Nucleic acid binder design. Structure first.
Lengths: 50, 97, 84, 64
RNA sequence: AACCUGGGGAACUGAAACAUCUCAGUACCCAGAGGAGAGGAAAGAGAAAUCGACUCCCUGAGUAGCGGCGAGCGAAAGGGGA
RNA sequence: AGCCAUGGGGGAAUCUGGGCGGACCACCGCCUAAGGCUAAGUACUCCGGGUGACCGAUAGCGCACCAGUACCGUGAGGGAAA
RNA sequence: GGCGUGCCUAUUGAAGCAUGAGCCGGCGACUCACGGUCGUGGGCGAGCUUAAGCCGUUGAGGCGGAGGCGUAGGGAAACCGAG
RNA sequence: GUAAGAGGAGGUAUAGGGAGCGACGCUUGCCCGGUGCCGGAAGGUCAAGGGGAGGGGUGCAAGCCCCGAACCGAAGCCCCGG
RNA sequence: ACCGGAGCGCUGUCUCGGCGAGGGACCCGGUGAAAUUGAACUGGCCGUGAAGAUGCGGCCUACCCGUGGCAGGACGAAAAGA
RNA sequence: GGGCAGUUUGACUGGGGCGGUCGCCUCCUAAAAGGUAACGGAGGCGCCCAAAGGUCCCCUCAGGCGGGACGGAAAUCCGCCGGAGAGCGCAAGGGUAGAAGGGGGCCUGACUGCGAGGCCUGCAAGCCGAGCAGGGGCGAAAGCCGGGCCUAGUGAACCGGUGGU
């Protein structure tokens, strides 16, 4: 169920993804959690859309 | 019941839009074991109505085979096949000068 | 034929029995990958050259010869010793 | 008259020119989110055979 | 009687239902034309500064395309000749 | 989604005129529209003769002998036997 | 006098009180057209084989290489090339 | 009847179409909440159409082509009522 | 010529049927169908059998064939079960 | 817009209507692997968590007797008896304290490229995953991290939508 809406953590550097899920019912805002894209290393990873 | 294991998914990048297919310069991959089989010269007219070729555009000499002091005639030459010319051969690109 | 009052149920459903048990026994050779036990809880416990992923299941790391281990005061173990 | 190659499976399958029909992996479309990279790099290609003998037939005329 | 050009146009079936589709613009109704017709001298054909009315036979090739991208349907250039 | 064709409505010009090169604009090529006649090779079997690893009166065309006669039904039409 | 529950079809299963069938003469059902595909008889050999047609023929054949087949596949593609 | 026209009807609302019960003698109560039928110059949504702020491709440029807002739109269903 | 209910007169509707009558049938004389049809050299009890036998079995009455008559069985004919 | 034309009108079933049902998980029926039928038994599930993931440091229950303001068969603490009947999100089964439980510091591996080999099974999916190369967290280090003790938390393919090559 939503209020926990899902998102695809898009990274900077012009794309590269890892897929997750939020939590609106929790104080969780946007999320720039440290993950590793298809190209490079454990750099950044932010949050976009659904 | 199910689709004929049609559960498979298509990819066929560019399965043709509608105005037709791309009028493109097709090719002709060939080996120098075929170049090895005949000495002297391997121009279009020889190899077409003999050998392989069949009215089909660009020839690309390549593959493994043998190096011999003979003339070839093609349009593009693989880096490997270019090195069988080194040992013995000739390098003729695109004809017209 | 006057069929007086009847009834109905809910107990018609049955879970699908997925294949369980140990796959190898003392002797056979695994080859890194050859899993050996589809177990629930630690009915058998890993040790030498034997791993255990996410489902409680012991498997293969080396080209080993299978063996068991009785330990009681810890339970039962499954060990593997290849060549050495 | 000349049997018709099935344009469909033609437009959507491979068989190595030796006779081994090898296809493309599915269950990959509207998932991705709670899934992981394991399914990603695995959902990159496929295999098959046996009934793809009948499918090797369905290709027909140009074989391919 | 068949062959012929247009004027209207089916349903059964296939898709294991079934309306898109198909069957096929096919059977069938009209009308007219003649040994023929129909067609027919280029706002063409299409990639190279290439050919040069029409109908016919062939390959092009079930290819290029088309579709609840299912059933299935499905041509033109080039070239070999009349 | 091109080109052809057209039912309505809007409605050019006469060679930098027009249409096409697959939406469309730029560059380069193709060809001159909205009037017309054309033999040849194509297609067929009422028909003449000619032939066949075609049949011999339940076969063969429906009809071998007076078969589109008998007789069916007002009727369209059915359809023998010998 | 010892032995003996027709035939076909259909059926878990027939003497079946399931059915076809009075008896006989005759007619009457697994082909072909295209392509594929496995195995086979041969000519061929990294080669094969022409199609329409034309020349001839009066059951008389030869000629006609356009084309399909075959050597490189691998990426959907550009294309890379025994990788 | 696609029509032309035809009937109705050389009839005219004491007529001609429909429905409902089926002499005559006595009789007909509750509800517009639904639905249909009716009646309506507010209001809502809404088809093509008008429109043009922004916008793209392209060519040096004049420009050609397309996307396209605000606001305007009825029949219809909602809305007021019988 | 509509469906109940009741009384009156009358009657073969009933008790309980008897006689007769002409015509079918029955005998002769002239002619001569049908549906069904595997074949039959075709009786019964007690069990047997996919549940219901002349036919299997442990067993029955009876010379061969016919004619009038009754209607129980041949899962009886009408149907490729209303 | 039923005036007319065209199709759809599932399957279920101790002969059919009605109810109920179609997928997954738990354990009986399962005859000591598997495994298996019934309108034969009892049940649960279409969600969850930025911490309920993660590395290291730490502590270990329920309950049993006695003792205590309010409470008081239960609050809570204490002393002792207590080797897992506590707790382990939600169904159980099973396993578990020589942790998977309960508290905390630093993070954020619900990573990228793969993939050895097996379980399963007609297929198709489902499934456990050594080990490798980049790079990163924890811990002095040994070593751990490709989600959470686990068995459900699912939807082939086209048709499209957004970001992007």
């Amino acid at each position: 169920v939503r209020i926990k809406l899902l998102l695809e953590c898009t990274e900077c550097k012009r794309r590269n993804y890892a897929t997750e899920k939020n939590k609106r019912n929790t104080p969780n805002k946007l999320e720039l959690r440290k993950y590793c894209p298809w190209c490079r290393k454990h750099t950044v990873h932010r949050e976009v859309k659904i | 019941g199910r689709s004929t294991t049609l559960m498979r998914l298509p990819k066929r990048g560019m399965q043709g839009q509608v105005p037709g297919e791309i009028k493109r310069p097709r090719y002709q991959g060939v080996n120098l074991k075929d170049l090895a089989r005949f000495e002297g010269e391997v121009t279009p007219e020889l190899l077409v109505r003999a050998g392989l070729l069949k009215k089909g555009y660009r020839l690309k000499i390549l593959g493994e085979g043998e190096a011999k002091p003979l003339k070839v005639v093609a349009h593009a030459f693989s880096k490997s096949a270019l090195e069988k010319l080194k040992a013995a051969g000739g390098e003729p690109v695109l004809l017209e000068a | 034929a006057h069929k007086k009052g009847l009834g109905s149920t809910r107990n018609g459903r049955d879970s699908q029995a997925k294949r369980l048990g140990v796959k190898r026994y003392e002797g056979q050779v695994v080859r890194a990958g050859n899993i050996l036990v589809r177990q629930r809880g630690t009915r058998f416990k890993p040790g030498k050259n034997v791993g255990m992923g996410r489902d409680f299941t012991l498997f293969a790391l080396v080209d080993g010869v299978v063996e068991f281990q009785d330990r009681g005061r810890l339970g039962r173990y499954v060990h593997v010793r290849p060549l050495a | 008259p000349k049997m018709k190659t099935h344009k469909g499976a033609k437009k959507r399958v491979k068989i190595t020119a030796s006779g081994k029909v090898v296809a493309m992996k599915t269950g990959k479309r509207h998932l991705n989110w709670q899934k992981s990279g394991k399914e990603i790099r695995q959902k990159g290609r496929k295999f098959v055979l046996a009934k793809p003998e009948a499918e090797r037939i369905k290709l027909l005329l140009p074989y391919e």
